[PDB]
Paper text:
Type II topoisomerase DNA gyrase is essential in bacteria and absent in humans; along with homologous topoisomerase IV (Topo IV) it is a major antibiotic focus, being the target of the widely used fluoroquinolones (FQs), the last class of broad-spectrum antibiotics to have been introduced into general clinical practice. DNA gyrase is a heart-shaped heterotetrameric (A2B2) enzyme containing two GyrA and two GyrB monomers. It negatively supercoils (underwinds) bacterial DNA by creating a temporary double-strand break in the bound DNA segment (G or gate segment) through which it guides the adjacent (T or transported) segment of the same DNA, consuming ATP in the process. During the catalytic cycle, a GyrB-coordinated magnesium ion is required to cleave a phosphodiester bond in each DNA strand, with DNA 5′ ends temporarily attached to the catalytic tyrosine residues of GyrA (Tyr122 in E. coli).
Initial analysis of collected cryo-EM data (Gyr–Mu217–Albi-1) converged with a consensus ensemble map consistent with a mixture of states in which Albi-1 occupied either the AA or the TG pocket with partial occupancy (AA and TG states). The compound also has the N-terminal MCA1 replaced by p-cyanobenzoic acid, resulting in a shortened molecule. As it was not sterically possible for these states to coexist in the same molecule, we used a masked three-dimensional (3D) classification to separate the data into three maps, representing the three binding modes. We refined models for AA and TG binding states separately, while the XT state density was not sufficient for unambiguous refinement. AA and TG maps also suffered from orientation bias and low number of particles; however, the density was sufficiently clear to allow unambiguous compound modelling. In both reported (AA and TG) Albi-1 models, the incorporated aza-histidine group was directed towards the catalytic Mg2+ ion at a 2.7 Å distance between the presumed metal-coordinated water and the N2 atom of the triazole. Further stabilization is provided by the larger isopropoxy group in residue 5 that can better occupy hydrophobic pockets at the dimer interface and the pyridine N9 atom of residue 2 orienting towards the phosphate of pTyr122 at a 3.4 Å distance. The observation that a shorter N-terminal p-cyanobenzoic acid of Albi-1 allowed it to occupy both the TG and AA pockets, along with the tolerance for hydroxy/methoxy groups in residue 6, prompted us to synthesize C-terminally truncated derivatives with the idea that two copies of shortened molecules could bind symmetrically and simultaneously to the gyrase homodimer. It seemed that the size of the N-terminal segment indeed controlled the positioning of the compound, with the larger N-terminal residues of albicidin and Albi-2 preventing intercalation into the smaller AA pocket.
Numbering used by the authors:
A (entry chain D), D (entry chain B): 405 to 806
B (entry chain C), C (entry chain A): 8 to 524
Write the structure that this text describes.
DNA sequence: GATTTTATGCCTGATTCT
DNA sequence: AATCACCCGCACAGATTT
DNA sequence: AGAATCAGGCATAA
DNA sequence: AAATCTGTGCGGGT
């Protein structure tokens, strides 16, 4: 039961799909090339063969049906990859965490019970899309989140957007595109370091001039610098926090740090912009970007959107207004799963030979793969816990950020 | 057909699943002891206006709204999560008030979704207190269309009171309930003195307190669990031996059973045990439990001894069980093993943060309202020139410009402002140019716009006096709000008052009895 | 225990069931052509604010709301009813816009409730036009808690354009689709001449027009059906023969199939026929329909001719079908057999009633608004005494009594008040005591309350002029509404304008082709 | 086979229930007296044996299970009513039209296949309640709509209701009850004949005196009555209606042709009034009631309701006020089906031997019942259509006027 | 309205191995 | 997650009996 | 006789 | 070799 077979009988032009969920499989059975394609829905999560016993594996339902459909034997002295039906196998699971878990279980089954199938290259992984964007005439699918951001950036700067500084210059595209890309890169770098320092502290530094530690020495201009920084922070503060500054000359180069009291009613000891911070390349690139992002706007300015105009006095307002304008005649659909798609979308996105997109699974080194399988999917709790803790957020602390 | 090696795919996929399950499904939060599903369910039930003294709603409506809006998962899991919170014999303090058939201790199951009805319980409104006054942060839902709270501004110590149980990838958590009055006494004792040891805390918190009211046997395991975070305890049923003389044949009566045990499976297990000649001296077995309470009757053989047969039941049957206490919770988004003092300290810090943010919000609102009330009083003090000017105004904008670009005489109202001086009620964002300078008020754009939307109905005496009274009380409110932020002692006094009020409202008695071996 | 004869009980119960089903489930209403389930579903979707230019809603929402509130029957029937209205190949003009897997022309399936989405279509808003202006009568639901319309105030001739099909106890109904433009032209022709004959109507209405665009083979049954109400027609597929020369090969290509025929069953039937040797001259059969149009390819042997096999296909397989036209509908709560002229007359009478009721409601609203504006204009011309009196009074109630106490001289705004057509702009319920008396105006209570809520922003010149402009426009509107109610000829002009606008908005082209034998 | 058997082995004190639906079956199994009561839930509508062939009856599952449960054989040369089980059989279907249809199908099966069981009186019909009414302490169940209306009428006059007309009269119970009951009867009489005349005309004719045909004449007497009625109707409107009139003579009596128009540009052109209507007894009883129902209310009139007084005219609004006062502390629930009832209610309302009510099925005439069964349940459409039309609303339009 | 087997970690009892 | 297995009326192939 | 191995149950997810 | 008999499906209900 639950197996829609193909008409092709030669085992060199057939394919097999393992769709997750009953409704997704039912939808896929409609829109498929019935000549040389087959379907086999999986109801939910399947057995873990690494922990389980051989007899319990044979007694189960899903794995028994899969073994029967493949046609090869099972276990030693019967397994024989020569008599293989459905020479190409495709997974095509959901696009969320549970889909990845089911994918890992299926990979464990295939590698542990049938090595030569994996090694010869008869296993493929499918990549269905996530977003669908329509703009009246243009209609296209977009995968994951990064490509959505790229599409949004391209559409926002699509036509017009001839920024006017004072009277009528014209950046005209690529310069504005480079500025936008660099600013977004710096924003992404800033977002991944909020643990160490406040966001506002990093945001304010771009507009203010360079610290210039080379000529600072002990001129006592650090007092004026920190005073100006604190005054600017407190002028437009809108969360009740207060800031103070402190300076000292414990070394040849005078050091300074702010003290911030925030809504939590607890005060951090300090956030010193020490030698490492000024010497770090992060501050250098921040100053490089801020050099072009000083008060370039004059007293009068505006953004020249297509058949539109609006006075502006900051880059963030211009970006927000352009994004808001670009999202007028745009419609987006986000798929929660494979059950949201009609058969035609499935055919033209995952099952069409001339426009699908898949990955081939291969093996690099056998011993490393075997050790990894035993460590993760085994039945020993402590190695798995240690491995998960090793790759936790502590090991995610990458100082490159580039 | 880009290639990809097996090891990288396996590692990335499994690590993604493990992290998501660890920090998104199983372990609870130390500050309020709720998994994400509980928080989302309570928030969804609050948004619809499903208060504790209103008509019920079908469970299907609430489940559908929760799935559609905030929680992108199935329906059976969410409905079972709702059902478990509405059973008296599961939680110490129920969070949902239900009507229908929500199962029973005998082993039954609840009805389908389109047949039960639910609303919030009275205590649940304490968990979501002061939610609208910018006390906690919000995060986007899955598709970036709504907002959900990061953590509820709870007022009950929910984690210890209701406990928890969960199974994650690589670790698990299991914490038993407690009594509310004891926990609040412990919190107050901690607030009095921060150097209190575990011995001081255990004086006010002797031990757990289950809903089914069994007996706890032994005391070393509780101390070990509270000291290190991991321990084991023994739960025993309350049984008695009764004899009515005459024939001299005694009987065993059972009134209460341990936590998380089914009655029907217990009875059938005892029946099977006596069938196979494994337990001697049991003649008859009956269940009289209905309405009044739980009563199980066991009639023993004539020549047997009640104590001998009874002591075999604890060792053999499920009338004695072992509970393994193991505390794991999220501190700052990462799992950790906690003991009692860490939990209490975390709760106190949470309360301090919430009170501070609420006070700041109220101060800002009071200052903003006082700013408009001053302008309205000044305008009403000199109505005749104002209307005379307005009558010759070509348009509203010209009238607003004329009002802004001139001073006004304070008149007889300035004396009131002599009480309000010293820059107490001036908003922070206001510039020094505006406001009273030399006995001549200066108006802004917003004040003029507020003056323009004044109704004739407020020209009578009573409406005139109401504004003055409101201003007079607002001054005292602003003074009190400043005083609370001006020192640390007043904050702790406010927290003490809140805890005492909660204890008086929602306190109750003890059920489980603790005995030595 | 009380005896009962079997005959009486059987007769009573079966007659009760029959009279419930005949007027309750199966037969449609003549005026709007909707069974009760369709009306209830559309009303429920309308009340939720589920318009045609907003985000979709899950089918569970609509089905659950309909079951809970209005329609007390099973959910499978309601969901199938919703699904049937979303298929382009079932209704000529779809009423529900869906997203998901709503089936294919093969008659495959539809996904469950949780895996689809729906909203109202653009045309579906023309059926429910002017529903809020008291144009149709409401009746209670099954438990005396809600209200449901008795009939939709439709603007499209839904019954003819969309058709119907139903089975009842002792009778049935079957009406095919039609084209919108032809039917609208027929209605317009009828309005200009009420004594038109069937031959006159059929010039503008040649015949049916199915969604699938087959060929109708005959012209004799259509006239009989339109003249007496019962008839029969033959639907024929579209196919042709093509020759490649070379070796004299022939192939048969099928593009368009009849109405209500499955492609998969047809293909398998032809396969079985060739397999059992019942059809001679067919070599191979293939399907090549892909995203652009329907194509079925049949290859014929070299010792056979295409025409003979084609005619054998027509006579044997389901490529040619018979359709029995049988028109039955409810007129005034009784079944009745009808022809074309009766349906058109019923639609026109429905439009007349709807327009008259809408006009009366608009007239009432205009009169009330003009009545309030008169009081506002009178009050604006006596500013100084009004403000003096309001200031002197201590309480709003005393001010209200003082305002109502004495008359007010009209002043310089009396030019427009007297220019009104005596009592054209006077509400009916207003007593003769109030209104413009001999040179003085008397204020009611509600007029005084409206005066008290006047803002200071209204004293500017532009605001003063806008009220007079609004009043002068309202007078013209009232005059036009009176003229519309007066004569019986303006009403037909209004109806003609509405029908022409609908034709321009939603017109389209013909699909099915009619030919002689 | 969903059959829950009882303990009593003697087939002379047992009972069997044929419940509709699965929810009702589960509840009945929950709440039964387990000693001598059995349950057999029915999935849905069952086969019709009048139209079905004999061979198809044995293949079906529902009728086969029913035959097995009863224990007797089926068909000639095997049926044996002596060896019977469950001497009492109870139907107990739902309280809506579908339940009645299923009841008719079951009766057809029993009468056609097992005549002796029906003739000896082994088939009963249950009768569960419809409405539940609660008033704090006093709660009860009410069956059918007529009982609910009678209960409402009785509760409307539950003490108090001392009608003070002018100075101090008092009907004091029975007189008021008779007046109210007769008025309700006349209202029902008006409602049944509502189709052929407007409601307003019938509601106003009772206020008018008798026609007084004795003094009728072609001039100066025919016009006064019609003019008075038209004037009394025109000055009482809320829907922009209009009443007009004309009269004519035919050498026998002077007849009226009143006309009325509302929300339509068409005109009925006639609502004739002649000797036919006055000769009817409906107008006689209406005038008899109207003789009592005159302007008895003086400038002062009130009803001394229990610590409540509502001095008003237009006694219909007084009746409305009395109804509202009656419903001040009344709660009503209407069961949707048998499923809504919990097991205790089902036990105590229908299944209790000492508090249930039922009906016993018996056959009066055999040939007439056979003809009726053939006419209704046969597979001939035309006789059934003719029978349904004959007993249509035309047969319900009985001109007895009483 | 009524349909069915898995992952994940920690505690117990019951049962099998040298 | 779509499917169980019957009621109602009309019209037409294919299969049996006179 | 005492280690090693096997099953079932508790709460949110396919 | 004409005349009966027998199944299949269309759309809202248990
Ligand atoms: C309908 C009801 C639930 O809720 C509503 C709704 N509902 C929705 O608005 C809704 C809810 C959920 C969805 N969800 C989805 O669209 C996705 C799509 C998708 C695609 N791919 N994956 N998922 N599906 C899921 O999330 C999902 C995922 C997994 C599932 N199962 C499994 O994994 C599974 C489980 C076990 C096994 C095993 N062994 C195997 C597999 C399942 N579902 C959409 N819409 C709305 C209104 C109501 C309502 O008001 N009713 C009501 C009020 C009052 C009254 C009255 O008066 O009596 C009457 C009525 C209601 O009750
Ligand atoms: Mg998912
Ligand atoms: Mg029912």
């Amino acid at each position: 039961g639950k197996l829609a077979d193909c008409q092709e009988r030669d085992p060199a032009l057939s394919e097999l799909y393992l769709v997750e969920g009953d409704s997704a499989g039912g939808s896929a059975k409609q829109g498929r090339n019935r000549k040389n394609q087959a379907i086999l829905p999986l109801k939910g999560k399947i057995l873990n063969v690494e922990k389980a016993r051989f007899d319990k594996m044979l007694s189960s339902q899903e794995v028994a049906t899969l073994i029967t459909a493949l046609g090869c034997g099972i276990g030693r002295d019967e397994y024989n990859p020569d008599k293989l039906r459905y020479h190409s196998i495709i997974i095509m699971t959901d696009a969320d965490v549970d889909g990845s878990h089911i994918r890992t279980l299926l990979l464990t089954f295939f590698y542990r019970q049938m090595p030569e199938i994996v090694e010869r290259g008869h296993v493929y992984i499918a990549q269905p899309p996530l977003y669908k964007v329509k703009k009246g005439k243009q209609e296209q699918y977009i995968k994951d989140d990064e490509a959505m951001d790229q599409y949004q950036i391209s559409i926002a700067l699509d036509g017009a957007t001839l920024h006017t500084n004072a009277s009528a210059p014209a950046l005209a595209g690529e310069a504005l595109e480079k500025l936008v890309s660099e600013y977004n890169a710096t924003q992404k770098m800033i977002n991944r370091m909020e643990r160490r320092y406040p966001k506002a502290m990093l945001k304010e530094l771009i507009y203010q001039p360079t610290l210039t530690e080379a000529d600072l020495s002990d001129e006592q201009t650090v007092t004026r610098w920190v005073n100006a920084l604190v005054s600017e922070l407190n002028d437009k503060e809108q969360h009740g926090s207060q800031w103070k500054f402190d300076v000292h000359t414990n070394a040849e180069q005078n050091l300074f740090e702010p003290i911030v009291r925030v809504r939590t009613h607890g005060v951090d000891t300090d956030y010193p912009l020490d030698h490492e911070f000024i010497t770090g390349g992060e501050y250098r690139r921040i100053c490089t970007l801020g050099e072009k992002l000083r008060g370039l706007l004059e007293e009068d300015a505006f953004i020249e959107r297509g058949e539109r105009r609006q006075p502006v006095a900051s880059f963030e307002q211009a970006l927000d207004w352009l994004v808001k304008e670009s999202r007028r005649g745009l419609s987006i659909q986000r798929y929660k799963g494979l059950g949201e798609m009609n058969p035609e979308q499935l055919w033209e996105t995952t099952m069409d030979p001339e426009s699908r997109r898949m990955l081939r699974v291969t093996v690099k080194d056998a011993i490393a793969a075997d050790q990894l399988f035993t460590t993760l999917m085994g039945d020993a709790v402590e190695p798995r816990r240690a491995f998960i803790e090793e790759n936790a957020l502590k090991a995610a602390n990458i100082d490159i950020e580039n | 057909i880009t290639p990809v090696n097996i090891e990288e795919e396996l590692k990335s996929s499994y690590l993604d699943y493990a992290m998501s399950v660890i920090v998104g499904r199983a372990l609870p939060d130390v500050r309020d002891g709720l998994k994400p599903v509980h928080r989302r369910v309570l928030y969804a039930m609050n948004v619809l206006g499903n208060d504790w003294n209103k008509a019920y709603k079908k469970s299907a409506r609430v489940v559908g709204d929760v799935i559609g809006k905030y929680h992108p998962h199935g329906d059976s899991a969410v409905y079972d999560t709702i059902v478990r919170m509405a059973q008296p014999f599961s939680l110490r303090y129920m969070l949902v008030d239900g009507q229908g058939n929500f199962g029973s201790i005998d082993g039954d199951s609840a009805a389908a979704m389109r047949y039960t009805e639910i609303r919030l319980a009275k205590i649940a409104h304490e968990l979501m207190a002061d939610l609208e006054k910018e006390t906690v942060d919000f995060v986007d839902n899955y598709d970036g269309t709504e907002k959900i709270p990061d953590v509820m501004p709870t007022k009950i110590p929910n984690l210890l009171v209701n406990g928890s149980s969960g199974i994650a990838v690589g670790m698990a958590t299991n914490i038993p309930p407690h009594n509310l009055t004891e926990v609040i006494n412990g919190c107050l004792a901690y607030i009095d003195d921060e150097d209190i040891s575990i011995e001081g805390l255990m004086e006010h918190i002797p031990g757990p307190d289950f809903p089914t009211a069994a007996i706890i046997n032994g005391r070393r395991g509780i101390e070990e669990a509270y000291r290190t975070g991991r321990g084991k305890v023994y739960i025993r049923a309350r049984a008695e031996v009764e004899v009515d003389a005459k024939t001299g044949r005694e009987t065993i009566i059972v009134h209460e059973i341990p936590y998380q045990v089914n009655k029907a499976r217990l009875i059938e297990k005892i029946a099977e045990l006596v069938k196979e000649k494994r337990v001697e001296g049991i003649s008859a077995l009956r269940d009289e439990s209905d309405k009044d309470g739980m009563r199980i009757v066991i009639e023993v053989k004539r020549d047997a001894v009640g104590e001998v047969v009874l002591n075999n039941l604890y060792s053999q049957t499920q009338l004695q069980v072992s509970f393994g206490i193991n505390m794991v919770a999220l501190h700052h988004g990462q799992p950790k093993i906690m003991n009692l003092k860490d939990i209490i300290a975390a709760f106190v810090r949470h309360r301090r943060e919430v009170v501070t943010r609420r006070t700041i919000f109220e101060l800002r609102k009071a200052r903003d309202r006082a700013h408009i009330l001053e302008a309205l009083a000044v305008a009403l003090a000199n109505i005749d020139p104002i209307i005379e000017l307005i009558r010759h105004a070509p348009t509203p904008a010209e009238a607003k410009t004329a009002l802004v670009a001139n001073p006004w005489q304070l008149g007889n109202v300035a004396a009131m402002l002599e009480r309000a001086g010293d820059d107490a009620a001036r908003p922070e964002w206001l510039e020094p140019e505006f406001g009273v300078r030399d006995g001549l008020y200066y108006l802004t754009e917003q004040q003029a716009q507020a003056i323009l939307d004044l109704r004739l109905q407020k020209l009578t005496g009573l409406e005139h006096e109401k504004l003055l009274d409101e201003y007079k009380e607002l001054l005292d409110q602003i003074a009190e709000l400043l005083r609370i932020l001006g020192s640390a002692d007043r904050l702790m006094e406010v927290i003490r008052e809140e805890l005492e009020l909660v204890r008086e409202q929602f306190g109750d008695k003890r059920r489980t009895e603790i005995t030595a071996n």
